[PDB]
């Protein structure tokens, strides 16, 4: 009874969210039509977190799907789980996305804002309690970055106390799908720094790299790339849904990992990952899990921690396992690499254990950490934005919507200060 409301924004959020609902529906044994056909009484203990109950034993997820063009939504309907969602939670416009941040924020976002908010109010005030909301969007696009940030501000004004956890995809440095990305990423960062409590950054390059290195997938499509992201989302809320030896929900994570209000951008990683042919030759144990998690290659964000230093880190474990063995590893990885931790905070590594593992896996672990290595990510976008901003004519696409040019200077200034702030704590 710590209900969480799910929000999916844009072409990226809908396709990530759609795969995400397949994972939990399998975890809790929910049939695609919405009826429970499971195998254990444990799965019905606290299923209220994500699903609502209708007459006749049907469960409806606490989800809202948001887009500006109907093309993405009709793909969700045709899916095997299309009939699962409540039809009134499908909110769409009738205009092109435009792939523009200002147009999504100001022109079409205002019209969709009131319609979306009242739908959220139906879900928000339908449950006995509400821990926080959950948002999935991309930062290189126009709807997820433009409209998503607008909804993030309105959610904060009405529900200040609740945890606004967001999962975001950061534009890639080498090759990316869009030209105007540097404007979209910079302007959205202004809104994300002050509004959201927690932000997780994921880069598509690492998901490609991890799949080629580890899973040995020759041609991974977005289906398997999204699957890695859905495990991280499932792992963080696992303490809410299942019992365990030591429980740790979202608000515990925010307290431990966030030392200062603005430094809350996080990196994520998941273990164990093994090639689907090599699983027989690998004795998966507790020391083996930590070997992957603290290995830099398993980061889903292309920001090598070794070039920076850690501030705080947290690990979630699932499955019946030794509490001594979990604690002993956390000692050693902190002690063996003392050159990569801040001296003025001892015991930088948080731990927690949950009883029930995901299907097929006897035990698994999840990593969330905060480090100065984010400076590499923001340097690339700021330098590219600087190159683009002097060529003022691309701004003309944003001026024709109502965006003042000073907003560019404001957006870069706060982004520049965050880079300095993440640098200043290295002393």
């Amino acid at each position: 009874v710590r209900e969480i409301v799910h929000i999916q924004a844009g072409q990226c959020g809908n396709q990530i969210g759609a795969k995400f609902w397949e994972v939990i529906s399998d975890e809790h044994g929910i049939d695609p039509t919405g009826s429970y056909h499971g195998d254990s009484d444990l799965q019905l203990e606290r299923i209220n977190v994500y699903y609502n109950e209708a007459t006749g034993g049907k469960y409806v997820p606490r989800a809202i799907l948001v887009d500006l063009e109907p093309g993405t939504m009709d793909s969700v309907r045709a899916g095997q789980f299309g009939q699962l969602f409540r039809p009134d939670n499908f909110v769409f416009g009738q205009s092109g996305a435009g792939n523009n941040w200002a147009k999504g924020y100001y022109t079409e976002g205002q019209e969709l804002c009131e319609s979306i908010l009242d739908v959220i109010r139906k879900e928000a005030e339908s449950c006995d309690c509400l821990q926080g909301f959950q948002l999935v969007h991309s930062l290189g696009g126009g709807t997820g970055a433009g409209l998503g940030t607008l909804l993030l501000n309105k959610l904060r004004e009405e529900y200040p106390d609740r945890i606004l956890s967001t999962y975001s995809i950061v534009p890639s440095p080498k090759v990316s799908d869009t030209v105007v990305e540097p404007y979209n990423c910079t302007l959205s960062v202004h809104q994300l720094v002050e509004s959201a409590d927690e932000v997780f950054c994921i880069d598509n390059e690492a998901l490609y790299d991890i799949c080629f290195r580890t899973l040995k997938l020759t041609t991974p499509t977005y289906g398997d790339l999204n699957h890695l992201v859905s495990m991280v989302m499932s792992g963080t809320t696992c303490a809410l849904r299942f019992p365990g030896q030591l429980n740790s929900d979202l608000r515990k994570l925010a307290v431990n990992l966030v030392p200062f209000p603005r430094l809350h951008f996080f990196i994520v990683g998941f273990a164990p990952l093994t090639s689907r042919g090599s699983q027989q030759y690998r004795a998966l144990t507790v020391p083996e899990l930590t070997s992957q998690l603290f290995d830099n290659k398993n980061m889903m964000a292309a920001c090598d921690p070794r070039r920076g230093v850690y501030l705080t880190a947290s690990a979630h474990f699932r499955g019946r396992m030794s509490s001594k063995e979990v604690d002993e590893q956390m000692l050693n990885i902190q002690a063996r690499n003392t050159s990569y931790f801040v001296e003025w905070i001892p015991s930088n590594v948080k731990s927690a254990i949950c009883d029930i593992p995901p299907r097929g896996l006897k035990m698994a672990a999840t990593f969330i950490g905060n480090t100065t290595a984010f400076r590499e990510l923001f340097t690339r976008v700021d330098s590219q934005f600087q190159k683009m901003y002097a060529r003022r004519a691309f701004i003309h696409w944003y001026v024709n919507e109502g965006l003042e040019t000073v907003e560019f200077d404001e957006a870069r200034s706060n982004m520049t200060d965050l880079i300095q702030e993440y640098e200043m704590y290295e002393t």
Binding site: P160, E194, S195, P261, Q420
Partner: protein, 56 residues
């Protein structure tokens, strides 16, 4: 160099130290009661005597 010292004040770029999210989370103490809750009209509020004979 004195200008350099004046530029970097001893705060050392601890920007935005109270963010919008933290201002949402902080607990706000109770305010004074609303006027309607206090309301009783004057003459009855001013009454002095009673019908119970507690004297001798």
């Amino acid at each position: 160099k004195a200008k350099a010292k004046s530029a970097r004040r001893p705060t050392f770029k601890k920007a935005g130290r109270s963010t919008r999210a933290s201002r949402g989370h902080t607990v706000k103490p109770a305010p004074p009661p609303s006027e309607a809750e206090t309301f009783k009209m004057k003459r009855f509020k001013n009454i002095d005597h009673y019908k119970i004979v507690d004297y001798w």
